[PDB]
Amino acid sequence: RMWWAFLASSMVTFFGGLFIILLWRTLKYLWTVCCMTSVKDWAGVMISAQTLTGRVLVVLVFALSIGALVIYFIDSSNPIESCQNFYKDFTLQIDMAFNVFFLLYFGLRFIAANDKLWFWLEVNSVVDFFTVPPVFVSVYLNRSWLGLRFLRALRLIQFSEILQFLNILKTSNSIKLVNLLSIFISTWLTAAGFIHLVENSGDPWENFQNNQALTYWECVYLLMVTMSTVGYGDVYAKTTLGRLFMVFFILGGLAMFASYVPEIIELIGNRKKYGGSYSAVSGRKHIVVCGHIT
């Protein structure tokens, strides 16, 4: 079966795009050794960020990223043998209808973010290069691929911006707390995706024969039972690659990703705060007391 053409579409677009951006900068450097630019600041930029009604370029792309991640949860549940539900149904058709927005939104960010090089190797740009081309290959071949799509879970990190723009989330302390909490959930769901991929496909030196049929939810559970250090061993990674990944996730998850100190300082920082505004209710009289109060 084909598989490497889907992967190549991301590897080639990312590295090729890095090189053409680098070489476009390099030929401008060579030009002095050899010896519509207004429209990009107007269009899209005026609605993407710090412009209040910009929900169509943040809340929408977030809700579409959650939808694309839910569609990945749906897709990973099947034995991948279907030839009817994986087409003109709540699968590849709707998946392409969500992913075409990310192409437009990536282009809009590319034409706005002047510095192309810093933008190209920006983390959220990397999540688009490993998501979008594979889905074009999938609708061109009329064949779904359960590749690196789980990386759409890395979009949850900026969920604090949505609650802050909608004024749901109050103190800078509570913004730090929700930022930390979302980094945990998105990392947990991402690492479970890597184990899922690496266990459902065998080791290549074993002709891919030693694979294990873990569901994505068994990988989410395995990560939790491991990172809490319970380790029942009812589920564990059996492939050589899966064992290499678990050694990395144990060593990086403990003692670097956990073993913060600000998660307690922000927790007690949430307890010190005596109020903000005094909602003055009508009909009640009011008085203010100050000076040496003890």
């Binding site: 590295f15 890095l18 450097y29 510095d115 090089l117 810093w118 030196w205 002709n207």
Partner: protein, 197 residues
């Protein structure tokens, strides 16, 4: 003009792809070499069939019917012996390593089907296909006279195309990593030298 911030991230990515390429080649070295250092000791040889027959033993196989089906059915044991001309001696013919390790008693496994008659026919037509070639017809076949002089195979343990993929792709990431840092240090250090004009 944030070029300093992008540039340092570009150099860190180049160093990451260098180190990732070197480490990936190291890891894939240790786990491919056990298969590869086995198969390079298995020699290609010429061999000729001495006899084809059933030994009257009967063995189990697993059939499938969809949804993790625990289907099982029996089949009759065939044996085939060859003269291995690289040793002038008997060996059993075994087709491939997966067949040998899934039943080392018998020369062939039928693709295990729902009905016993389909196993019987498959083994009988395989036996009949070899009954036409009990003779001097040299068979290009794989033998391990170094540590396994008893059985001979028609096929190798691995398709070398995936072995080669498994070394060319990490070597490409090492080459891209060094090529990224070597191209980018000019666009860093010589761009300012030529902009100072």
């Amino acid at each position: 003009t944030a070029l300093k911030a992008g540039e340092d991230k570009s150099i860190r990515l180049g160093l990451f792809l260098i180190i990732s390429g070197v480490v990936s080649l190291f890891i894939f070295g240790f786990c491919w070499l056990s298969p590869a250092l086995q198969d390079l000791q298995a020699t290609e040889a010429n061999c000729t069939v001495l006899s084809v027959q059933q030994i009257g033993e009967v063995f189990e196989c697993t059939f499938t019917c969809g949804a993790d089906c625990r289907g099982t059915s029996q089949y009759p044991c065939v044996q085939v012996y060859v003269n291995n001309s690289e040793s002038n001696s008997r060996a059993l013919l075994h087709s491939d390593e997966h067949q040998l390790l899934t039943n080392p008693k018998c020369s062939y496994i039928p693709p295990c089907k729902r009905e016993n008659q389909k196993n019987l026919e498959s083994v009988m037509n395989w036996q009949q296909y070899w009954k036409d070639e009990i003779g001097s017809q040299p068979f290009t076949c794989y033998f391990n006279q170094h540590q396994r002089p008893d059985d001979v195979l028609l096929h190798r343990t691995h398709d070398e195309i995936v072995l080669l993929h498994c070394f060319l792709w990490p070597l490409v990431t090492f080459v891209v990593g060094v090529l990224i840092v070597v191209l980018t240090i000019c666009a860093k250090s010589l761009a300012v030298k030529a902009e100072a004009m």
